[PDB]
Amino acid sequence: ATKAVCVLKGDGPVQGIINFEQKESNGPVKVWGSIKGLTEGLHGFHVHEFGDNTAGCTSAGPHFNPLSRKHGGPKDEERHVGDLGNVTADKDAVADVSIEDSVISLSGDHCIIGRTLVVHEKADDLGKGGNEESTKTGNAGSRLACGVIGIAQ
């Protein structure tokens, strides 16, 4: 039962800790924690390809997509491996995250350890938009905070 963890930081008020846990090699991954400092509403939430924070969140590259698919929401059969949808922040700027995902893994070719989790300025449109960008990034806007996903006990 592997566990992983991510400490999310950036240049504004967004701060957070996100935990990952996967009981079996082909079980769902439970993703949970809290992000504070976010505007009330939806914020796109994705695993990005590189665990490179050398220029902040920009160096993480694009959404993690080892199967070369189009962007979607987490419950779409067409999506990037890293497409975890939107987190929702309350009026006190806190997003309490509690997700179960079928596509990300802590092993194999969907393995996300060593890559970057990113929280965005605006809502992810889940790939349902009337432009090609929607099918690439979900139009979620700037990267507000991020962290490298590491092995936890």
Place this chain on the structure above:
Amino acid sequence: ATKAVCVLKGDGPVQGIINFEQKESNGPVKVWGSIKGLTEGLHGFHVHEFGDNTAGCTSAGPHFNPLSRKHGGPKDEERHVGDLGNVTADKDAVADVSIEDSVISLSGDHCIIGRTLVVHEKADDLGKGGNEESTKTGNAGSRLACGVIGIAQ
């Protein structure tokens, strides 16, 4: 080939970027970069077991030691996989790092991606310090900065 990268951050002025490169599965890893804000002299340099920085460098756990050995220098036969010896800072407080190591790896069983790189307050005694602590940690003292090791382009 694989690349990885680590951005070292702490509570004081120590900071830097360390690059990893591995040409072949289970071939040697080149480790290079620059660390500033270090007092002149030797500072222990290890991969710790967990990529957990939620409580900062404290949460990273002990030396990465999957083969259950005792602590040594990097050129010793008896060492932890994480044992990278010492880096040396100059009089301008800068440590230029260039290491090649054959025991750490960016894939397979000695994989350090998702783990934590740590640079320490003083010299690692290379497990020859003559007490039990030496055989555990090399007596290198507190952790000045660390970063989670992430996959790079």
